[PDB]
Each structure stands twice: as C-alpha cells, then as structure tokens.
Structure 1
Amino acid sequence: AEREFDMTIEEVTIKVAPGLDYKVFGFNGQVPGPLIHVQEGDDVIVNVTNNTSLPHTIHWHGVHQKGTWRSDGVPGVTQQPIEAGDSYTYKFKADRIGTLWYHCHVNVNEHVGVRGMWGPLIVDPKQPLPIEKRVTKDVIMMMSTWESAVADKYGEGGTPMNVADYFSVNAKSFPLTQPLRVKKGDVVKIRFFGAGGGIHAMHSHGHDMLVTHKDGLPLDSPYYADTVLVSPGERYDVIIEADNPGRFIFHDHVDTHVTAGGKHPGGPITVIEYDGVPVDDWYVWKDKDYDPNFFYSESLKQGYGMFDHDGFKGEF
C-alpha cells in the first residue's frame, strides 16, 4: 500500500538525566523520533519540514532505495541538504524487511551522536519467522551517548576531543528510564539499536536471549547469548522467554556506561519486572511513575503508520 507521513524537525530540549537537560533536533519534537511501522512492499512517502535553524536530511538506514537512490538522504551525494525552513519529500518502496532506522546524515557526528536525530523504522515481513509468530510483546531499545559540555549549544560535539559522560536507552539515563513490565509466559522480542556513537554490551539478568536477526535480517543460525554487543549502526533482534518471574535488571555491561556525569548508578539500565512479584520496601522503582510505551511496545501494536509518543517529546 501507499503510506504517506508528514514529519517536522524541531529545536527542543529534553531531559536525559537528573542533572542533564539537552538541546536536540527532534523529529516531530521528540527523541526517539516517531515510530514508523510499515509492511514489506509498501510505498512510503515522507514529507519533511525543517523547523530548525540548521540544514538536515533524513537517511533511511537499511532501506535499499531500489530505483530511488535520490531519496537516500546523503547531502552532497544524493541530494542537497534540506535548509532551514524548507521542506523535502522522500519516496521509497519498503522492500527490505525487519528492524531498520532513520537518522540525519548532515553533520552526523553531532546531529546523530548527541542531537537525537534518529528513530525506528519497522518493516513487517509479509512472511515472518515462526519464532516471530509466538511473540506477545515487541520492544525497541535505542542506545546513545551524550556530551554534557555541549548540551545547550548546537554546533559542537561528537568529536574524539569531547567527553561522552552520559549514556541512555531511548534518550533517558537510569533512574529516568522505565521498567520492562512482563507477565509469566510472555514471548518478548527486543530490538537493539546502536543509534549513537558508542558500543553497548546489553546483558539480561535472569534470562538468555535468542539472537534471531542481524540488522533486521533473520539468521540462518540463531544463537543464544546473555550479553549482546551493539555498535554504531547495528541492530540485533532477540527473543526472551518470560518464564522466570522476579525483578531482573537489564543493562549495558560496559562499566563506564553505568554512570552519569561521573556518578553511579546511571545509564542504559532497565528492569524486567514480572507482574505479581511483591514489591519490596527498598525497591528502587517502588511507586514508579510508569510509562507502558517507553519502549514503543504499545505503539507497536497499533498497525501501520507513524506514531508519536508524548513521553519522548521535548520542550520548546
């Protein structure tokens, strides 16, 4: 089918960590950008309006651009950039299946590295794996890093001379991340994204992960892991059988990554929280103000389209 979406680029401020508000260029004013969910073979049309002060593009990572290379989104190579105030339309056929993503391709070290210019693009195979058939919950985790020294000033950041001192999943640092709430018997698909410039060793306590897809394509030889290394650009899809009730932390195992501005704990940390496990008095997330769509799992149930999430919106 033909699916047409309108996107903006906005200058907004987001709260990444306690102690760290960050100036970003949010797609539709949010970080992660809106979930785009379509079916294998669809014709996609995205009209982009640049409501910021600087030029951008959108590149569709993993999208072949079969017969549409002029929509690849690379300045100086497939198009001239989208300037401030201007608009531009992308058209492509979603013939590549799986977990894809989209991001700015202007000044990528800064725009993608620390200005949040990215979001998920999920293409459903017309014919999914048997394994995907059993899935009861779909989960998106986009990891990135932040440089506090340049949080308020567009135009700097993302070089080897900068210090990345805050780490996140879906643009929040623990304890501002949210738990992954499951019930016994759930079949959980988790899609990891190396959205920023760091490497993330994602480790699930209490469970092994079945690695089923690399960069959205199904592996002929899936393998189990308790720790999955995710590096810039990559995606890994895993399956977790939620058959082991408890509270099980789920986090980046890169030691410096579980800090925030030098202080521990912080970073890409969540907790697999099983329904019905009694909450202890000392539980860090006792009485959490809970967001069931922090990993886009509600949005992912709503069919094809473009989904904003107010939990990800920034302030003007």
Structure 2
Amino acid sequence: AEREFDMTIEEVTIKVAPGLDYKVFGFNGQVPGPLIHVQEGDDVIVNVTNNTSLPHTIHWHGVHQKGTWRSDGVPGVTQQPIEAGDSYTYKFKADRIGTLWYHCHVNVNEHVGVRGMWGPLIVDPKQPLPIEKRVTKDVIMMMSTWESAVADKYGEGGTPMNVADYFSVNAKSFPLTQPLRVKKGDVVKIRFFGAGGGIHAMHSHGHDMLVTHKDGLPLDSPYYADTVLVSPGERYDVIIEADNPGRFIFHDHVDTHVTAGGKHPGGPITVIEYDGVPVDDWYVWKDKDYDPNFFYSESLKQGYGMFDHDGFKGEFE
C-alpha cells in the first residue's frame, strides 16, 4: 500500500529528569519522534517541514533505499540539507523488514547525540516468526544519553570533550520513566535501540530474554540472555515470557548510567510490574501517574500509520 505522512521538525523543551529540562529538535515536537508502522512492501512517502532555525535531514536507518538512494538523507552525499523553513519529501519502498529507525543525519554528534532527533520505524514482515505470533505486548525502548552543560544551547554538545551525565529510555530518566505492566501469561516483545552515543547493558530481573533479531532481521540461532548490550545504531528484538509474577526491575547495568547529574538512582530504569502482585506502601512507584504508551505499546496495536504520543511531547517557546 502507499502510505504518506507529514512530519515537522520543531524546537521544543523536554523534561528528561527532575530538574533537567533539555532543548531538543523533536520530530512533530516530541522525543522519541512519532512511531511509523508499515507493512513489508509498502510504498512510504514522508513530507518533512523544518520549523527550526537550523538545517536537518532524515536518514532511514535500515532502509535499503533500493533504487532510491537520493532519499537516504545524508547531507553532501545524497542531498543538500533541509534548510530552516524548508520542506523535503522522502520516498522509499519498505522492502527491508523489522525494527528500523530514523534520525537526522546533519551534525549528528549533537542532533542525534543530545537533541533527540530520532524515532522508531517498524516494518512488519509478511512472514513473521512463529514466536512473533504469540506476542501479546510489543515494547519499544530507545536508549540515549544527555550532556547537562549544553541543555539550553543549540549548536553545542556531542563531543569527546563534553560530559554525558544523564541517561534515559525513551527520553526519560528514572523516576520519570514508566513501568512495563504485564500480566501472567503475557508474551512480551521488546525492541532495544541504541539511539544515542552510549552503550547500554540492558538487564531484566526475574526473566531471561530470548534474543531473536539483530538490527531487525531474525537470527537463525536465537539465544537466551539476561543482559543484552546495545551500542549506537544497533537494535535487538527479544522475547520475555511473563510467567513469573513479581515486581522486577529492568535496567541498564552500566554502573555510571544509573545516575542522574551525579546522583542515584536515575537513568534507564523501568519495572516489570505484574498486575496480580499486591502493592506495598514502600514501593517506589505506588500511585504512579501511569502512561500505558510510554513504550509505544498501545500505538503498536492501532494499525499501520504514523503515531504521535503526548507523553513524549515537549514545550514550545
């Protein structure tokens, strides 16, 4: 099918952590950018308008651009940049399946490293693995890092000289992240993305993960892990069988990453919360103001298309 989307690039401010507000260039004014969910073989058209003060592009990471290299999104290689106020249209066939993503390809150390210019692109295979058919909950986790010294200043950041002192999943740092709520018998697909410049060792308490896909393509030899290393650019898809009720933390095991501005706890932490487990008064997330779509799991059920999410939206000036 032909699927056409209109995307903008906006200057907004997002709250990454308690006391850390961050200026970003959000696709449709949010970080992570909108979920794009299409079927293998769809023809995709994306009309992009740059409502910011600086040039950008969009690169479609994992998309082969078969006969369509001029839509690859690389400035000075496949196009000139999309200047401030201008528009540009990308066209590609989604013939590469799996967990893909998209991100700016201008000034990437800064724009992708700390300005949140990225989002997920899910291409459903016409022939999914048998296990994929058992899945009852699909979860996106996009990890990145932040340099507080340049939070308020576009044009700086993302160099070896800077210090990454805050860490996140889907642009929030614990406790501002959200739990992953399941019930016994759920079959959970988690898609990990190394969206930023850091390496993240994602560990699930209480469960092993069956690693089934690397960069969106199914492994001939899947393997179990309790800790999956995710590095910039990569994706891993795993399956968790939710057959062990409890409250089980799920987090980046890199020790300095579970900090926020030098304080702990913080960083890419969630909790696998099973519905049947009674809540203790001392539980850190008792009475959490809950977002069921923090990992795009509700959007991923809503059919093909492009989905914004207000829990990811930042504030305009």
Q: If the TM-score is normalised by the length of the shorter chain, which range does it land in?
A: over 0.9
Unmatched tracts of structure 1, length 5 or more: none
TM-score, normalized by length of structure 2?
Answer: 1.00
SS state of the match for residue 192, structure 2? strand
Query: Quick one: percent identity of the two aligned structures?
Result: 100
Q: Provide, for residues 104-140 of structure 1, a one-character-per-residue CA deviation record: whole Å limited to 9, x for no partner.
A: 0000000000000000000000110001010000000
1:205-233 per-residue CA deviation (whole Å, 9 max, x = no partner) reads 00000000000000000000000000000
Q: In structure 2, the residue corresponding to 1:256 is in which secondary structure?
A: helix
1:50-76 Cα shifts (integer Å, max 9, x gaps) = 000000000000000000000000000
| Counterpart secondary structure, 2:228 | strand
How far apart in 1 are the matches of 2:35 and 2:284? 29
CA distances 1:250-285 after superposition (whole Å, capped 9, x unpaired): 000000000000000000000000002010010000
CA distance in 2, matches of 1:127, 1:237: 16
SS at match of 2:300: helix
- 1:296, distance to aligned residue in structure 2 (A): 0.1
Displacement of 1:19 in angstroms is: 1.1
Distance 2:169 2:275 in 1: 22
Q: Whole-Å Cα distance in 2 between the matches of residues 152 and 30 of structure 1?
A: 17
Partner of 1:282: 282
How far does residue 193 in structure 1 lie from its aligned partner after superposition?
0.1
Count of aligned positions? 316
| 2:20 alignment counterpart | 20
Q: Does the residue aligned with 1:132 lie in a helix, a strand or coil?
A: helix
* Aligned counterparts of 1:126 and 1:303: Cα–Cα separation in 2: 15
Distance 1:52 1:126 in 2: 38
TM-score (structure 1 length as normaliser): 1.00
The 3-state SS of whatever aligns with 2:152 is coil
**How far has the Cα of 1:25 moved from its partner?**
0.1
What secondary structure sits across from 2:25 in the alignment? strand
- 1:277-300: CA deviation from partner (whole Å, max 9, x where unpaired): 010010000000000000000000
* Counterparts of 2:254 and 2:263, CA distance in 1: 15
Tell me the distance in 2 between the aligned counterparts of 1:134 and 1:193. Answer: 22
* 1:144-194: CA deviation from partner (whole Å, max 9, x where unpaired): 000000000000000000000000000000000000000000000000000
Q: Which runs of 4+ in 1 moved over 3 A?
A: none
Matching of residue 202 in structure 1 with residue 205 in structure 2: no
Aligned Cα root-mean-square deviation (Å): 0.2
SS of 1:85 mapped into structure 2: coil
Q: Measure, in 2, the Cα distance between the counterparts of 1:296 and 1:132.
A: 17
